[PDB]
Paper text:
In the case of [name], we were able to decipher the mode of L10-N peptide binding by X-ray crystallography. These structural analyses showed that the C-terminal domain of [name], which is preceded by a non-essential N-terminal extension of ∼50 amino acids, folds into an eight-bladed WD-repeat β-propeller. Moreover, the binding mode of the N-terminal residues of Rpl10 (L10-N) by the eight-bladed WD-repeat β-propeller of [name], as revealed by X-ray crystallography, allows establishing a refined model for the final pre-60S maturation events that lead to the stable incorporation of Rpl10 and the release of Nmd3. Taken together, we propose that [name] may protect Rpl10 from aggregation before and/or promote its incorporation into almost mature pre-60S subunits in the cytoplasm. We conclude that the β-propeller domains of [name] and Rrb1, which harbour the essential function of these proteins, recognize the very N-terminal residues of Rpl10 and Rpl3.
To this end, we also performed in vitro binding assays with the orthologous proteins from the thermophilic, filamentous ascomycete [name] (ct), whose proteins often exhibit improved biochemical properties. Both ctSqt1 and ctSqt1.52C (deletion of amino acids 2–51), which fully complement the absence of [name] in vivo, could be efficiently co-purified with ctRpl10 or its N-terminal 20 residues. As a first step towards the elucidation of the recognition mode of the N-terminal residues of Rpl10 by the predicted β-propeller domain of [name] at the atomic level, we independently determined the crystal structure of ctSqt1 at 1.94 Å by molecular replacement and of ctSqt1.52C, lacking the dispensable N-terminal extension, at 1.5 Å resolution by single-anomalous dispersion (SAD) followed by molecular replacement using the ctSqt1.52C Se-Met structure as the search model. While the N-terminal extension could not be resolved, the crystal structures revealed that residues 52–533 of ctSqt1 form a typical eight-bladed WD-repeat β-propeller; thus, being composed of eight blades that each contain four β-strands and showing the characteristic ‘velcro' closure owing to the presence of the N-terminal β-strand as the outermost β-strand of the eighth blade. [name] and ctSqt1 share a high degree of overall structural conservation and mainly differ in three ctSqt1-specific insertions located in the loops connecting β-strands 1c-1d, 5c-5d and 7c-7d. Analysis of the electrostatic properties revealed that both β-propeller structures notably contain a negatively charged top surface, whereas the bottom sides exhibit a charge-mixed surface.
Author numbering: 54 to 105, 127 to 223, 228 to 331, 366 to 466, 489 to 540
The structure:
């Protein structure tokens, strides 16, 4: 019924976004809508989960005149907290986390509003370019900013998509940024100019891969909604309408060709994740299923988990980076859905060539009752999961790998 060990009910309506500090997993920001009126503002909070039953915020994020839709702490060390709204506002806060005193301080620095609606954030993982963030917007544009020193630098502003930019993902080296659109296009941007210097950019001078609706072998009718890049940076996966997934080659810094096409599930692929260390790709669908493909076997189907979240949308799937049982590295997947449940899966099973349900966490309302889980973070080890719900609640769950035996 309710597996949570703590909660936060301060949001007045849908909690759309959540971010976790990269060094301090107890520091989590949540953001969403304060109501359904046309003029309802957005609101965010910063929480300290180490206090985990009712949580009290350590900071409040004000200034958004519409729902907060995106949050991120910057890489590598969370120097900034950035909020992004349906008002197009990007608000930048400096973060200080004193190992001495009672910790976290947050200071507003700047606001940028180059678009009307922010759809997503993705921090750049390049160690060479700290505190760099990308976003995609409803006008199809993709912006890359660096937070340094006019504290907001514009690194890139791209206008290649012609419809809403629905998702973005960096390559692991942080040199490429892959984004997708409702208009069915994929563009992979040479953000820092490295590919251009190696004569690996397309005719438009900006991308290393550009595929659109005119490319018949690529076109996914109804649009693209998710994107993920493999751990070696060798391929990008895009997911879209009708359960379709396309695998496209990237240059290593071969490029732009379709290496595999998939369509096992029946509705929008809303979430895609490559395992960080097992040769598998997981896809979550609006139809409630998760599908697992073997990346070293032409993306053969390993397992089709029908009803992973009943017949409600699978909103997010994400691999546990460093599970307590080191032997399970790369094989443990956490998912959340509009059924109001968070689940974790052991993906070793299935057809691997030459259920797997591990744990369920309940507490949110289902979509049918006005809830649904819209997002989560789970730290490095997956042992503490913090959720955001359409039922305006934030929950904290634990995996309990440490039994504290006597």
């Amino acid at each position: 019924e309710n597996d949570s060990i703590a909660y936060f009910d301060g949001h007045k309506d849908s909690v759309f976004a959540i971010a976790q500090h990269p060094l301090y997993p107890n520091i989590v920001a949540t953001g969403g809508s304060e109501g359904d009126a046309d003029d309802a503002p957005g609101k965010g909070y910063v929480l300290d989960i180490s206090a985990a039953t009712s949580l009290n915020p350590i900071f409040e994020i004000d200034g958004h005149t519409d729902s907060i839709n995106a949050l991120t702490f910057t890489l590598p060390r969370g120097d900034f907290l950035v909020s992004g709204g349906m008002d197009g506002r990007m608000r930048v806060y400096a973060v200080s986390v004193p190992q001495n005193g009672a910790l976290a301080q947050f200071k507003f620095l700047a606001e940028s509003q180059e678009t009307e609606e922010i759809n997503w954030f993705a921090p750049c993982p390049s160690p060479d370019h700290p505190n760099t963030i990308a976003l995609g917007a409803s006008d199809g544009s993709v912006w890359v900013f660096t937070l340094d020193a006019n504290p907001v630098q514009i690194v890139q502003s791209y206008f290649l998509h012609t419809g809403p930019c629905t998702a973005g993902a960096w390559s692991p080296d942080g040199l490429l940024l892959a984004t997708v659109s409702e208009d069915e296009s994929l563009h992979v941007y040479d953000v820092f100019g490295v590919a251009a210097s190696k004569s690996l950019v397309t005719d438009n001078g900006q991308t290393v891969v550009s595929l659109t609706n005119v490319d018949q072998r690529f076109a996914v009718e109804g649009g693209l909604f998710s994107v993920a890049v493999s751990p070696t940076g060798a391929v990008v996966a895009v997911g879209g309408a009708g359960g379709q997934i396309k695998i496209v080659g990237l240059p290593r810094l071969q490029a732009g060709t379709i290496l595999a096409s998939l369509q096992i599930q029946s509705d929008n692929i809303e979430s895609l994740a490559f395992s960080p260390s097992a040769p598998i790709l997981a896809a979550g669908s609006t139809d409630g299923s998760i599908a697992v493909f073997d990346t070293s076997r032409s993306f053969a189907l390993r397992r089709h988990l029908r009803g992973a979240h009943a017949e409600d949308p699978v909103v997010k799937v994400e691999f546990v980076k460093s599970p307590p049982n080191a032997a399970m590295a790369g094989w443990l997947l956490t998912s959340c859905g509009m059924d109001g449940v968070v689940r974790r899966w052991d993906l070793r099973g299935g057809t691997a060539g030459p259920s797997g349900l591990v744990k369920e966490w309940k507490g949110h309302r289902s979509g049918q009752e006005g809830g649904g889980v819209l997002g989560f973070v789970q730290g490095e080890t997956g042992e503490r999961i913090v959720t955001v719900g359409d039922d305006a609640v934030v929950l904290v769950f634990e995996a309990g790998s440490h039994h504290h035996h006597h």
